[PDB]
Amino acid sequence: IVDTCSLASPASVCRTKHLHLRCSVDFTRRTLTGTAALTVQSQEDNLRSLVLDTKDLTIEKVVINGQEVKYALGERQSYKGSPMEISLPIALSKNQEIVIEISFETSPKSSALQWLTPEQTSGKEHPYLFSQCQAIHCRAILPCQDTPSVKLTYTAEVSVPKELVALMSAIRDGETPDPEDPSRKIYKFIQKVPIPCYLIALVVGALESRQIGPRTLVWSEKEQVEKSAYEFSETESMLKIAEDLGGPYVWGQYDLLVLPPSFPYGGMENPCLTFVTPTLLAGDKSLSNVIAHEISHSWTGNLVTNKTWDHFWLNEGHTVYLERHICGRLFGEKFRHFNALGGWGELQNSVKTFGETHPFTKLVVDLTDIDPDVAYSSVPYEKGFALLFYLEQLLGGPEIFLGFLKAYVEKFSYKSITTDDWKDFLYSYFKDKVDVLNQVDWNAWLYSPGLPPIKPNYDMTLTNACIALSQRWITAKEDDLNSFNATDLKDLSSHQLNEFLAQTLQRAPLPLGHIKRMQEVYNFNAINNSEIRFRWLRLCIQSKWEDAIPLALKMATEQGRMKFTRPLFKDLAAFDKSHDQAVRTYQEHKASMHPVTAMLVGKDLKVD
Ligand SMILES: O=C(O)C1CCN(Cc2ccc(Oc3nc4ccccc4s3)cc2)CC1
Ligand SMILES: [Yb+3]
Ligand SMILES: [Yb+3]
Ligand SMILES: [Zn+2]
Numbered sequence: 001i002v003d004t005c006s007l008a009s010p011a012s013v014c015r016t017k018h019l020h021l022r023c024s025v026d027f028t029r030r031t032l033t034g035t036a037a038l039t040v041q042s043q044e045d046n047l048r049s050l051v052l053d054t055k056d057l058t059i060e061k062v063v064i065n066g067q068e069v070k071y072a073l074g075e076r077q078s079y080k081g082s083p084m085e086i087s088l089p090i091a092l093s094k095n096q097e098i099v100i101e102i103s104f105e106t107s108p109k110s111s112a113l114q115w116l117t118p119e120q121t122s123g124k125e126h127p128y129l130f131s132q133c134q135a136i137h138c139r140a141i142l143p144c145q146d147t148p149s150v151k152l153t154y155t156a157e158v159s160v161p162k163e164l165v166a167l168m169s170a171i172r173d174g175e176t177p178d179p180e181d182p183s184r185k186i187y188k189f190i191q192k193v194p195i196p197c198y199l200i201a202l203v204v205g206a207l208e209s210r211q212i213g214p215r216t217l218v219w220s221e222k223e224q225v226e227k228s229a230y231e232f233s234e235t236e237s238m239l240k241i242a243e244d245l246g247g248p249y250v251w252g253q254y255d256l257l258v259l260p261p262s263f264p265y266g267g268m269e270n271p272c273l274t275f276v277t278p279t280l281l282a283g284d285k286s287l288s289n290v291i292a293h294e295i296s297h298s299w300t301g302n303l304v305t306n307k308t309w310d311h312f313w314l315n316e317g318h319t320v321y322l323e324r325h326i327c328g329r330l331f332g333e334k335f336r337h338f339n340a341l342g343g344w345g346e347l348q349n350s351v352k353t354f355g356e357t358h359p360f361t362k363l364v365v366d367l368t369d370i371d372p373d374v375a376y377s378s379v380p381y382e383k384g385f386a387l388l389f390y391l392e393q394l395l396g397g398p399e400i401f402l403g404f405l406k407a408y409v410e411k412f413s414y415k416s417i418t419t420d421d422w423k424d425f426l427y428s429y430f431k432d433k434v435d436v437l438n439q440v441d442w443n444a445w446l447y448s449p450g451l452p453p454i455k456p457n458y459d460m461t462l463t464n465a466c467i468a469l470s471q472r473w474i475t476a477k478e479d480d481l482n483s484f485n486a487t488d489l490k491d492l493s494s495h496q497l498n499e500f501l502a503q504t505l506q507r508a509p510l511p512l513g514h515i516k517r518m519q520e521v522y523n524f525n526a527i528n529n530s531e532i533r534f535r536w537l538r539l540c541i542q543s544k545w546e547d548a549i550p551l552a553l554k555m556a557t558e559q560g561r562m563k564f565t566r567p568l569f570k571d572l573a574a575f576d577k578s579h580d581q582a583v584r585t586y587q588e589h590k591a592s593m594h595p596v597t598a599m600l601v602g603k604d605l606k607v608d
Contacts, residue, residue, distance in 0.1 A: 005372060038101075038143075079371040116128040128203075135198060141202075203257055219273075241330070256276055264561065265562065279559050361383075386452050386456060396433075465500075484521045
């Protein structure tokens with residue numbers, strides 16, 4: 001099959017087996033410079049050239065067998081970058097391996113990287129750098145076959161200023177002073193498990209660590225270490241449940257890195273070193289499902305990988321499925337259903353936003369000429385989860401379906417697969433229930449836009465109180481506002497308080513007087529919890545409360561998690577009173593934003 005997001009030679013021509021990265025981080029120039037030595041295996045007879053993906057890279061030279069070789073960079077193809085064709089000195093036979101050493105330098109504008117000044121950090125004394133390769137940004141760090149259909153091991157040596165620490169998506173393999181510059185340190189890394197290149201990750205900063213489990217360190221700037229160790233204390237218990245559900249954890253270490261607030265995602269499942277947003281630091285462990293999700297990716301996504309980005313639901317859907325089972329084991333089956341029903345609500349929201357006929361609402365998408373960052377949404381997570389949860393109910397329950405999940409991980413470990421490979425194995429494992437499987441509307445579930453053709457069965461126990469309070473507020477008239485009181489929330493957990501807000505937000509706007517009363521009785525303005533605060537500010541802005549304008553703008557800019565930043569900017573642009581402020585704020589902050597976040601907020605606000 002064809003990876004339409006890559007310009008490199010496909011896996012049927014050649015395959016990268018290993019990467020040996022030797023680089024230096026220069027904060028003054030905002031460049032990563034070094035050599036990427038690719039061990040490439042030919043898959044064809046008489047192979048004389050190959051093509052690699054690049055994006056805003058400066059190539060100095062290409063060396064094979066100790067000699068410089070001819071290379072050519074093609075015309076840039078927008079978000080795909082520029083193809084780099086390399087002329088091999090000797091024709092290769094099938095299975096023959098060669099080492100190709102590429103000397104490169106990144107651009108300060110690399111879409112994979114964010115360079116932070118000391119002022120943008122917690123400590124204010126040192127700069128900071130972090131990468132984010134998923135989906136197709138690894139090509140903006142180094143020349144590679146930037147496709148999840150190719151898996152490679154890697155070794156790396158990273159030179160950094162001596163007062164800083166480097167970490168990667170690999171096992172730490174020591175540190176020494178740089179033998180070429182005593183003002184620097186070299187940090188060494190080893191990733192012995194084969195991975196797709198989007199899982200390559202680097203962070204350089206004034207980082208400290210604290211042990212929180214037998215195979216877990218939490219890493220962050222000094223200011224966040226204590227809070228992070230507490231917030232993520234359930235990590236080991238989640239790893240033990242995940243091992244029981246998916247089989248052995250093969251990665252050795254499971255560390256966590258708490259990034260600065262501009263980190264654009266909730267979490268990134270980088271092997272050995274999960275990256276997390278500091279917006280999870282709620283103080284009560286209530287946002288720990290993000291850790292359960294990243295842990296689950298150690299099986300679904302990192303071991304069993306989607307062959308192309310069109311089949312991304314395979315990564316997300318199975319991970320959400322496993323994550324909800326972890327939380328189900330820790331908190332109970334009623335909680336798993338509450339989270340599952342919440343997920344259906346988030347799917348309804350995504351489908352309503354794009355429109356029910358939009359191609360991005362399809363489970364399997366055609367990404368030909370589509371930037372994956374633009375296509376990204378809750379759809380592959382929630383529609384993917386909904387399908388598996390529906391199959392679980394159709395096939396005899398969670399115990400039976402978890403047996404299939406474990407066999408699926410074992411079958412496809414270290415491989416890259418498509419929706420057809422998954423479906424085929426599903427039919428094979430469930431051969432005694434093929435009559436049941438033939439009742440599924442596969443064409444609709446996998447290839448049709450909008451809401452799924454069937455809604456699963458959900459226990460309502462924990463959801464009932466959220467729906468009842470939301471309906472009281474929506475149906476309330478002016479003379480009913482007096483009946484609301486802080487006592488309404490006494491029996492609600494933080495998760496139920498969030499679901500109350502999500503239910504009400506789906507019916508927004510509410511009258512301005514109702515929103516004013518909600519602040520008067522519930523004091524939602526005082527809640528620090530990022531998920532609750534975000535839904536509350538969206539509710540205020542959509543209900544046209546001018547007092548919420550500075551609070552929404554502050555939240556949209558003081559952190560950069562796209563889940564929060566994008567809808568807050570969009571809501572502020574849609575409110576007449578704040579439109580000009582939203583545009584101006586984006587324009588002032590654009591140059592100091594994460595490049596992917598800056599691009600997407602620009603598109604949402606229609607500001608070039
Ligand atoms: O833990 C996590 O999952 C976080 C990890 C960071 N990350 C970034 C990201 C960006 C672009 C992507 O591309 C695609 N989007 C779609 C949407 C629909 C169908 C196919 C595709 S392929 C995929 C992932 C995701 C959030
Ligand atoms: Yb070692
Ligand atoms: Yb009344
Ligand atoms: Zn994920």
